[PDB]
Amino acid sequence: MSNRPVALVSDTRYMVGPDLARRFAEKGFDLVLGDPSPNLVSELESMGARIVPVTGHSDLSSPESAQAQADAALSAFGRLDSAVMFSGQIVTGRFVNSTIDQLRQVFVGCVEAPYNFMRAVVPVMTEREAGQILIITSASGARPTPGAPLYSSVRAAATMLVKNVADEVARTGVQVNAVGTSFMDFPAFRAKIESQVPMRRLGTMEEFSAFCMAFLDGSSRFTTGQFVAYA
Amino acid sequence: NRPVALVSDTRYMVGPDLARRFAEKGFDLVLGDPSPNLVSELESMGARIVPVTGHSDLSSPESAQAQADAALSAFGRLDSAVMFSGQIVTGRFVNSTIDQLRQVFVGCVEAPYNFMRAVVPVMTEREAGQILIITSASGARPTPGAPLYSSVRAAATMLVKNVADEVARTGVQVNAVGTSFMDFPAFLKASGANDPEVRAKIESQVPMRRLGTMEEFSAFCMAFLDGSSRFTTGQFVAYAGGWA
Amino acid sequence: MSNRPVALVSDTRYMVGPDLARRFAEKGFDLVLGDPSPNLVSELESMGARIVPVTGHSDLSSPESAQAQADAALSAFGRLDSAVMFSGQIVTGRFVNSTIDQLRQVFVGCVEAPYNFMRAVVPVMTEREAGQILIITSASGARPTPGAPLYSSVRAAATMLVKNVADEVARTGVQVNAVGTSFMDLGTMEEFSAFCMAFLDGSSRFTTGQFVAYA
Amino acid sequence: MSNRPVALVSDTRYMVGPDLARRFAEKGFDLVLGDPSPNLVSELESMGARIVPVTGHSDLSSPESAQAQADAALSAFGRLDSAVMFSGQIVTGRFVNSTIDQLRQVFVGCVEAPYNFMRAVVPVMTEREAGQILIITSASGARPTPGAPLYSSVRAAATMLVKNVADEVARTGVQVNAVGTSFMDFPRLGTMEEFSAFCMAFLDGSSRFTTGQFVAYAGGW
C-alpha cells in the first residue's frame, strides 16, 4: 500500500530510541513510534518521514500493547518492514540474598516484553514474506555475570527465544536478531556508569543506532538468529 | 556418619533410580514422596530414609525449604542434592500464548531456582556440597516445535552457571545435566517411562537413536553427586544421545 | 599521513572482494587492493578513491605476503584504518575416510591465513590506537558440520583466534571481528558487502570479538 | 575374541595415565598401555588385569603411532572397548609477539594428536558397533586465554573435532567425548585419582548414551 518501507521503534522516550528513528528517517523509512516527543516528531518530519505516534504502550507490558503497535503500522501504512524494541531493568545482588519475586520481575521485563513484541510483529511480517526484527538486550545472558545472577539467567532466555523464533521463520525470509549492550544494564538510560563496564567506554547513542541499522535498514537480508554484543 | 542426599522427587522418571544409586554408595536419604515399596527397598540397601510429602513439585520457596530443613533436622548435614523439573509444551511460536511461556518458566526455571535457593546456603555454610539440576537439552539450541520450552530451559542452565560461579570459592559444586528423559510425558512412573512405545517417540529425536535405561542415566549423574570427585562446577552436560 | 581513511581489501579477484572495495569507495575510503583488475581500478577511481594495487600477495600463504599488504598501506598513505580478508576452501568427506594431509590442508587456509593477516595488520593499527579488522570465514566452525568435520574443526580455531586477538587489543580501541558465510564454502555480493560495512566503515567503534553468521 | 572389556590408555608415563589404568583394572578391564613402567604393569597384574605394553608410540606424532596402539589391542584381545589419550603443551606469549611456527607447533600437539588417535580408534569401534573414546584436553579452547592465545585457538579446534567425530558416528553406538583439565596447562585442580574417577563416567561402560560433550573438570590454574 505504501511505497516507502515502514519501521516500528517500540519506545522513543529513552536510550537509543530517538536515534533509531533518526537513522530510519535518513534511510527513507516512514515511522511508527512509541510515545515520541513533539520535537522528535517535528525533527523526523523535517527529514521527510511520515510519523505515526502510538501513545501509552511503549512499556510493552501486555500482549495487547505490542499488538496495538503492530496494528498501528498496518492501519496507517499497510506494511511493517522493520521493528525494534529494548526492555528490561537490571536487578543486582548475590543469588543467596535474592528472592523468587525478583526472578519473576526480571523475567517480565527481559523475556515477556520481547516475547509479546515478536508474537505480534512476526505474523505481520511472515504474511508479507519480508521483515527485520531487532531485540535490544543486555549481554549479561551470554556468560555468568557476578552480582546479577537472576538477570543474567533471564537475559539468556531472551536470546534463546530470539534464536528459536528466527529458526522457525527463516524460510519466510523474515529476520530476527538480538544485540546486547551495556546501555541496558544501567537504570539511567556517565562517569559512574563507565566505571562498571570493562573497558570503561560506552560510545555514543548515535554510533549505537548506526550499528543497529545493519539488522534493520533493509540493506541485507540474510542475517538471522544472531546475538551480537555491541561495544 | 553417612553422607546425606536429597532427591527432590521420587514419584517419577529417574527419581527412584537416583535414590538407589545414592543408597548403594552409602548415603542416607531425604526423598520427595517415595512410595512405601521404594522406602523398603532403599532400607534393605542400608539407607535411612526421611520422606517429605507434598513438596516435590517445588512450586513454592517453602516446598524447597521444607526438603532442605528435613535433611538438617534428621541428619544435621546435607551433602548432595538433585532435582528434576519441567513439562514440555509444544507448538510453533507464531501460535503460542504468553500463558504457555509463563507455564514453562515455572516448571523449568522457578523450580530449579527454589531448589538451589534453599539448598545452596546450607552447603556454603558447611563449605562442601554437590548439587545437580537435571533439565532438558532443549535449551542448548533452537528446538523446532518447542521454542518457548527451549528458551526457558536456556535460562535454567544459565542460572546454574551463575550460581556455580558465585559459590565456586565455597567448595560447593553446582552442575546441570540436560537429558531427553526430561522431555517425556508428565507424571510418568517407572513402567510408563520404560514402555517401548513411549521411549520410541523420544529416542527418535536423538542422534544416537537410543536413550539407554534410567539406571544407566542415574549412574552418570553420580559423577556429579557421589563425592568421588570435587570442584567440577558450572557445567552443562548433555545426556541426550548426542543431540547437544 | 593522508587525511582520508584507508581500507585494505586483501583479495579483489573473487567473491565479495570487489564489492567490499565499492562500499569503501562510496564511504570515503582510499583503497589498498589485492590483485585488482584494470576495470575494477578504473571504476573505483571514477568513484573518487585513490587505489594502491598490491600484486602477488593475495594468497596470504606466507606472513611476508600479509606484511607486504600492510606495508603498502603505510608507504602510500601512512595509515591503515580498515582491513578485511576471506580465506579457506571447503574439504568434504567422512572423518573415518579422512587423512592427516587433509587436516593440515584446511588448517592452512582457515587458520594460518587469518593468523598471517592479523599478525601483520594488528600492530599497524594498535600503534595508531584505531582500526577495524574483519575476518570473513565459514559458518562451519560454530557447530558440527556433517560431511565436513575437519573443515568445521579448523574454522572453530579461526573464530577462537579472532576472539583471542580481539581480547588482546581491546584496550587500544582496535576492533577485530569475524563474519561467517556459506559463500566461503544467499542474496547478492553487494548485499553481503553492505552488511560487512557494519564492522568496517567507522560508523561505530568498540564492538569486538564477535562471530556473526551471514546465512 | 577375549571375554574381558579392553581399554587403551595411550600414555601411562605422565599425569593421569597411571590412574586411568588403575581405574580400568578396578572395573574389570584388560589393558593396552603406552610405555607403562614395570612397577605399574606389576601393580595392574596384581589387580587381575591382563596387560599389553605398547612401547614408543605414546607421542601419537604420526598416524602410524596411533594405528600401532589400536592394532595392538586387536592383535592381543580382538577388541577395543575404551580408549583415552591426553596431549598438547601450552605456549605462552602475546599474539603480537607470536610467530606462525608457534601456531603450527601447538596445532600438532593439540589437534594432530587427537586426530591421529580418533582416526585410528574410531573405525575399530564402529565395526564392533560399540566403544567409548575420551580426549583429555585443556579448557583453554572454550574462552580467550590472554597468556596463551594461540594455544586457546587450537584447543578450540580439538574440541570441535571431537564434536564432529561424535556427531558423525553417533548412530554406530560409539561415543566420543572431551574433558578439559588444568593438568594439561603445565609447561582447585583436585587429585589425580579423583580426576581418573571422573573420567570413568565416559569410559567404564556404566553409561553409554552421552557423546559429543566437552566437560571442564575441576577448576584452578
Contacts of A18 (CB under 8 A, 6+ apart): A12, A36, A40, A205
Contacting residues of B for A153, CB less than 8 Å apart: 109, 155-156, 158-159, 162
The alpha carbon of D153 is separated from its chain's Cα centroid by a whole number of angstroms, namely 19
Nearest to C35 by CA among C23, C62, C50, C17: C17
Chain D residues within an 8 Å CB radius of C176: none
Rounded Cα gap, residues B12 and B84, in angstroms: 10
Question: HSE of C147 in the Cβ direction (CA atoms, 13 Å)?
Answer: 3
Cβ neighbours around C86 below 10 Å, total: 25
**Are D190 and B239 within 8 A, CB to CB?**
no
Of C11, C4, C16, residue with least CA distance to C179 = C16
Handedness of CA C1, C3, C5, C6 (dihedral sign): negative
Alpha helix ranges (H) inside D78-215: 100-107, 113-128, 149-169, 192-199
Q: Are B132 and B182 in contact (CB under 8 A)?
A: no
Cβ distance of A144 and B157 shorter than 8 Å: no
Q: Does residue B136 belong to the interface with chain A, where contact is any CB pair within 8 Å?
A: no
The answer to whether residues D85 and D111 touch, using CB atoms and an 8 Å cutoff, is no
Chain A nearest-CA residue for B61: A100
Q: Is B165 on the interface with D (CB under 8 A)?
A: no
Alpha carbon distance D52, B78 (integer Å) = 44
End-to-end, the C-alpha distance of chain A in Å comes to 38
Flag if C207 and A199 touch (Cβ within 8 Å): no
- Supply the DSSP string of chain B, one letter for each residue: ---EEEES--SSTTHHHHHHHHHHTT-EEEEES--HHHHHHHHHTT--EEEE-S-TT--SHHHHHHHHHHHHHHHS---EEEEE------S-GGG--HHHHHHHHIIIIIHHHHHHHHHHHHHHHHT-EEEEEEE-SGGGS--TT-HHHHHHHHHHHHHHHHHHHHHGGGTEEEEEEEEGGGGSPTT--HHHHT-HHHHHHHHTTSTTS----HHHHHHHHGGGTSSSS----S-EEEESTT--
Query: B90: exposed, middle or buried (C-beta count within 10 Å: 0-12, 13-18, 19+)?
Result: middle
The amino acid at residue B241 is G
CA of A150, closest CA in chain B: separation in Å? 7
Is residue D201 classed as helix, strand or coil in its secondary structure? helix
Residue in D closest to C112 by C-alpha: D100
- Which chain A residues are within 8 Å of C195, Cβ to Cβ? 214, 219-220, 222-223
Nearest CA in chain C to A177: C212
What grid cell was written down for C14?
Answer: 573473487
- Closest residue on chain A to C191 (Cα): A220
8 Å CB contact between C2 and C27: no
Q: Which three cell numbers stand for residue A31?
A: 515511522
Which domains are present in chain D?
6-216 (3.40.50.720)
Torsion sign, CA atoms D201, D207, D208, D209: negative
- Rounded to an integer, what distance in angstroms lies between the CA atom of residue D34 and that of residue B160? 39
Write the DSSP string, chain C: --SS-EEEES--SSTTHHHHHHHHHHTT-EEEEES--HHHHHHHHHTT--EEEE-S-TT--SHHHHHHHHHHHHHHHS---EEEEE------S-GGG--HHHHHHHHIIIIIHHHHHHHHHHHHHHHHT-EEEEEEE-SGGGS--TT-HHHHHHHHHHHHHHHHHHHHHGGGTEEEEEEEETT-----HHHHHHHHGGGTSSSS----S-EEEE-
Residues from chain D that touch C120, judged by Cβ atoms under 8 A, are none
Q: What distance in Å separates the CA atoms of residue C203 and residue C200, rounded to the nearest whole number?
A: 8
C-beta atoms of D211 and B235 within 8 A: no
Hey, of D202, D209, D211, which one would you mutate to test binding to chain B, going by the most B CBs within 10 A of its CB? D209
Provide the chain B residues 216-235 that lie in CB contact (below 8 A) with chain D.
216-217, 219-220, 223, 228-235
Whether the CB of D208 is below 8 Å from some CB of chain B: the reply is yes
The backbone torsions φ and ψ at residue B31, rounded to the nearest 5 degrees and listed phi first, read -130, 140
Interface contact D161, partner C, CB < 8 A = yes
Three cell numbers at D22?
588403575
D126 in contact with C, Cβ within 8 Å: yes
- B233: closest chain D residue by CA: D218
The Cα-based distances of D217 to B82, C79, C81, D138, D178 in angstroms read 19, 46, 42, 9, 10
C-beta separation of C32 from C76 below 8 A: yes
Task: Tell if the CB–CB gap between C150 and D161 is shorter than 8 Å.
Answer: yes
Is A63 part of the contact surface with chain B (CB cutoff 8 Å)? yes
Interface contact D201-B220, CB threshold 8 A: yes
On the 0-12 / 13-18 / 19+ scale of CB atoms within 10 A, A71 is middle
What lies within 8 Å, CB to CB, of C51 at 6+ separation is C30, C31, C33, C36, C41, C44, C45
Which element (helix H / strand E) includes A211? Answer: helix A205-212
Cα nearest neighbour of B210 on chain D: D209
Please tell me what resolution, in angstroms, this structure has: 1.6
The answer to whether D164 and C149 have CB atoms below 8 angstroms apart is yes
Q: Is B147 an interface residue toward A (CB < 8 Å)?
A: yes
Shortest Cα–Cα distance, D140 to chain B (Å): 15
Do C111 and D103 make contact, defined as CB atoms within 8 angstroms?
A: yes
